Amino acid sequence: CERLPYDASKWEFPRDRLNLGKPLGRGAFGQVIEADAFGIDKTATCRTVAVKMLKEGATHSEHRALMSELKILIHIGHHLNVVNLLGACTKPGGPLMVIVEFCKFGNLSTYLRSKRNEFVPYKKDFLTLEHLICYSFQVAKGMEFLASRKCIHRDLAARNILLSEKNVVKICDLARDIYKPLKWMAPETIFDRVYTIQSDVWSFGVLLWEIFSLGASPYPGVKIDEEFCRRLKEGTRMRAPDYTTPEMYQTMLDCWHGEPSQRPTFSELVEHLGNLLQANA
Ligand SMILES: COc1cc(Nc2nccc(Nc3ccc4c(C)n[nH]c4c3)n2)cc(OC)c1OC
């Protein structure tokens, strides 16, 4: 994948126009940090951005990984409902840095949990059914986009959905091709370790359950063991979450169809959720 091209003219950002701020996360692969970037959208403005940068030193593997991730992001292109690439610092004499949009409210599951006593179905800063269906609609749109670029997301879950201003949600993009988180996995993946876009439709149903439980853990008080997998195969499903509509629960069950080809597609979900948005609003 580091074999796809890197057009520096289009993507390269000067390191002296990045001012690094607080770390958002770290791991045995990289470090993600908040930064202020001047002129990253060509305009004479500062924008807060998110930067993924390598570790203190080398590894070739880790270098190729981040570099491949950059090229994938370029290859996929832009959509409102994914975390978009803004630029990169790849030239010699500094660390490899990949620069993406910053989502200032962080991950969706943590956020929803924080609004459990600030929620009203209809009627301040309160969450309402409109908001939850709007988020669901947005993620579907994001996944419809990834699908059209022939990606699967290995971990479609509320923790991997970030929230920006103006209620915009973005899939934090785990992005592989036609591919070969147990509570989020389709049964054909659990048993065959294989991921397709229809496997993501299953995970999206679990994500919907997360949204309409306001950030609860899936399969409450259930052991993820040999039984759980037997139960899922036989057709056992989660019960409705506390804040769901009937139609949203029906959609969850649709997404959890045993046969992958009987699950709706993301396009179908975008349509259906758009009508629920209009029926609510
Ligand atoms: C969820 O963590 C936050 C993300 C953000 N916002 C954000 N925008 C774009 C990319 C990005 N990457 C990113 C960072 C950190 C992590 C960890 C850890 N796992 N995966 C991660 C991905 N993050 C803002 C935050 O503060 C507002 C966060 O912490 C509350």
How is residue 159 written in tokens?
């923790």
Chain centre to alpha carbon of residue 202: 14
Are 22 and 136 in a shared domain?
Answer: no
Residue where one domain finishes, among candidates 78, 102, 126: 102
HEC assignment per residue over the chain:
CECECCCHHHHECCHHHEEEEEEEEECCCCEEEEEEEECCCCCCCEEEEEEEECCCCCCHHHHHHHHHHHHHHHHHCCCCCECCEEEEECCCCCCCEEEEECCCCCEHHHHHHHCCCCECCCCCCCECHHHHHHHHHHHHHHHHHHHHCCCEECCCCHHHEEECCCCCEEECCCEECCECCHHHCCHHHHHHCCECHHHHHHHHHHHHHHHHCCCCCCCCCCCCCHHHHHHHHHCCCCCCCCCCCHHHHHHHHHHCCCCHHHCCCHHHHHHHHHHHHHHHC
Are 122 and 85 in a shared domain?
Answer: no
User: What is the Cα–Cα distance from 142 to 270, expressed in whole angstroms?
Assistant: 9
What burial letters (b/e) apply to 123-134, b meaning 16+ CB within 10 Å? eeeebbbebbbb
How far does the centroid of ligand 1 lie from the alpha carbon of residue 239, in Å?
Answer: 30
How is residue 215 written in tokens?
């950030």
Please give the order of strands across the beta sheet that includes 18-26. 18-26, 31-38, 46-53, 97-101, 85-89
Active-site residue, selected from the candidate residues 7, 36, 41, 155: 155
Are 248 and 198 in a shared domain?
Answer: yes
Torsion of CA 58, 64, 67, 71, to 10 degrees: 180
- Tell whether ligand 1 has an atom less than 6 A from the beta carbon of residue 50: yes
Amino acid found at 71? K
Are 8 and 109 in a shared domain?
Answer: no
- Tell whether ligand 1 has an atom less than 6 A from the beta carbon of residue 25: yes
Residue where one domain finishes, among candidates 74, 102, 130: 102
Neighbouring CB atoms inside 10 A of 96's CB total 17
What CATH number is associated with residue 43?
3.30.200.20
- Tell whether ligand 1 has an atom less than 6 A from the beta carbon of residue 21: no
Nearest residue to 157 via CA among 117, 223, 196, 211: 211
User: What is the Cα–Cα distance from 258 to 59, expressed in whole angstroms?
Assistant: 42
Are 69 and 204 in a shared domain?
Answer: no
Are 72 and 150 in a shared domain?
Answer: no
Residue where one domain finishes, among candidates 83, 102, 121: 102
β-strands 161-163, 169-171 pairing: antiparallel
Q: Contact, 139 vs 250, CB < 8 A?
A: no
Are 27 and 110 in a shared domain?
Answer: no
Q: After which residues is the chain broken (C to N over 2.5 A)?
A: 123, 173, 180
Crossing angle for the helix pair 197-212 and 129-148, nearest 10 degrees? 170
Are 116 and 247 in a shared domain?
Answer: yes
- Burial grade of 104 (CB within 10 A; 0-12, 13-18, 19 or more): exposed
Q: What distance, in Å, lies between the first and last C-alpha atoms of the chain?
A: 44
Are 95 and 172 in a shared domain?
Answer: no
User: What is the Cα–Cα distance from 278 to 67, expressed in whole angstroms?
Assistant: 42
- Tell whether ligand 1 has an atom less than 6 A from the beta carbon of residue 249: no
User: What is the Cα–Cα distance from 204 to 110, expressed in whole angstroms?
Assistant: 17
How far does the centroid of ligand 1 lie from the alpha carbon of residue 144, in Å?
Answer: 23
User: What is the Cα–Cα distance from 43 to 180, expressed in whole angstroms?
Assistant: 42
How far does the centroid of ligand 1 lie from the alpha carbon of residue 28, in Å?
Answer: 16
β-strands 152-153, 46-53 pairing: unpaired
Domain count, the chain: 2
Are 128 and 97 in a shared domain?
Answer: no
User: What is the Cα–Cα distance from 60 to 248, expressed in whole angstroms?
Assistant: 46
Range of the domain at 44: 1-102
Are 129 and 77 in a shared domain?
Answer: no
Nearest residue to 151 via CA among 77, 87, 212, 225: 77
What CATH number is associated with residue 173?
1.10.510.10
Residues annotated as binding site for ATP? Answer: 24-32, 52
Is-catalytic flag, 16? no
Backbone region of residue 52 per phi and psi (left: phi > 0; alpha: psi in -120 to 50; beta: other values): beta
Are 66 and 76 in a shared domain?
Answer: yes
